Amino acid sequence: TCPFYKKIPGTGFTVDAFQYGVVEGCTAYFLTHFHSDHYAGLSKHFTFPVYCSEITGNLLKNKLHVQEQYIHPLPLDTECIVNGVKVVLLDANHCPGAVMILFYLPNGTVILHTGDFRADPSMERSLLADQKVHMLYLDTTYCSPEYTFPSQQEVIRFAINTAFEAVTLNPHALVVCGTYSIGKEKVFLAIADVLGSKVGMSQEKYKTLQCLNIPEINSLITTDMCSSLVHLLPMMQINFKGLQSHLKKCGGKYNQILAFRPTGWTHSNKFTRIADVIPQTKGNISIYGIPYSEHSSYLEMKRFVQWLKPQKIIPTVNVGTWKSRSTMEKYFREWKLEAGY
Numbered sequence: 001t002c003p004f005y006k007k008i009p010g011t012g013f014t015v016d017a018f019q020y021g022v023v024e025g026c027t028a029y030f031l032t033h034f035h036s037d038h039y040a041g042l043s044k045h046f047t048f049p050v051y052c053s054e055i056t057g058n059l060l061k062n063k064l065h066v067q068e069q070y071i072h073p074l075p076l077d078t079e080c081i082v083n084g085v086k087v088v089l090l091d092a093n094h095c096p097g098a099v100m101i102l103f104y105l106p107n108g109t110v111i112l113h114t115g116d117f118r119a120d121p122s123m124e125r126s127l128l129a130d131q132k133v134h135m136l137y138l139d140t141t142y143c144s145p146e147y148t149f150p151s152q153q154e155v156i157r158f159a160i161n162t163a164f165e166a167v168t169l170n171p172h173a174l175v176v177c178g179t180y181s182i183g184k185e186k187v188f189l190a191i192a193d194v195l196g197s198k199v200g201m202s203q204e205k206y207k208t209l210q211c212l213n214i215p216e217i218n219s220l221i222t223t224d225m226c227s228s229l230v231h232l233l234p235m236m237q238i239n240f241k242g243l244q245s246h247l248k249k250c251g252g253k254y255n256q257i258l259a260f261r262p263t264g265w266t267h268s269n270k271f272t273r274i275a276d277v278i279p280q281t282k283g284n285i286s287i288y289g290i291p292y293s294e295h296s297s298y299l300e301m302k303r304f305v306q307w308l309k310p311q312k313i314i315p316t317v318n319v320g321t322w323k324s325r326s327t328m329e330k331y332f333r334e335w336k337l338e339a340g341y
């Protein structure tokens with residue numbers, strides 16, 4: 001059965017609620033982004049209207065084979081009417097195609113559902129600036145002050161400088177980047193750009209990337225692995241055994257691997273600056289864990305909420321334990337006392 005925090009009161013609507021079968025009273029299913037915890041349940045046999053971004057809809061049609069007649073793509077930053085209710089989709093600063101959804105209820109209540117997001121001060125100048133929000137359904141993934149990490153720009157600067165140094169020292173080194181889901185594409189695209197290379201990958205990953213409306217993509221990616229010195233591999237193969245095995249396959253073209261694992265936060269963030277990060281090494285293989293996050297840090301989250309001043313907050317992440325829920329409620333009250341709403 002569908003949990004309450006996936007239902008939008010006063011509507012026929014649900015958000016990211018595809019794994020509960022037919023939800024009683026739901027006339028339109030919204031999907032904020034193409035990540036498996038959120039699309040779980042959708043398949044080619046789904047027969048209700050799905051509302052989403054253009055990019056999400058490309059992935060639903062091409063990767064999940066959802067039939068086209070049930071896919072309803074909406075433009076961003078544009079007032080739209082769905083089953084008689086005004087909605088707006090806003091960029092969530094998450095992965096490609098990810099949105100936040102503003103719902104303007106018939107009774108005058110305004111609800112923001114963030115989906116998954118990385119809060120940014122640029123959101124303070126979207127269509128959110130213009131009106132009051134009564135209820136916020138919030139991505140609370142990193143809702144605790146221990147969760148600190150650098151800007152995406154500092155992390156990319158580290159990666160580009162690390163890769164350019166290694167390959168200039170050793171023209172026979174290969175760079176490998178781990179991937180499992182969409183998101184974080186800037187990691188491998190920025191490295192390939194500094195190296196003057198396309199990025200090489202499997203046909204299935206090329207197919208996924210071709211759904212994302214990235215400008216000039218045909219100039220940046222390829223399935224011809226032999227022509228490329230940046231390769232993408234499944235995240236599970238980013239270890240010494242899997243990388244050794246990959247280097248065999250390259251037919252003596254390369255004699256060294258430098259590999260990157262974009263993670264979320266890890267506890268090494270509570271001790272080390274990005275500048276100071278070092279790899280795990282075995283022989284001619286080195287592996288860097290880099291903290292490239294597509295979710296808000298604690299401080300980013302706090303700033304957004306203190307600016308928006310919602311009347312009520314409903315967390316959508318970390319809701320399964322009483323300890324997590326009590327922790328998050330305590331921070332919500334502090335933020336409200338400190339800012340005065």
Ligand code: NI
Binds near residue numbers: 094
């Ligand atoms: Ni996500």
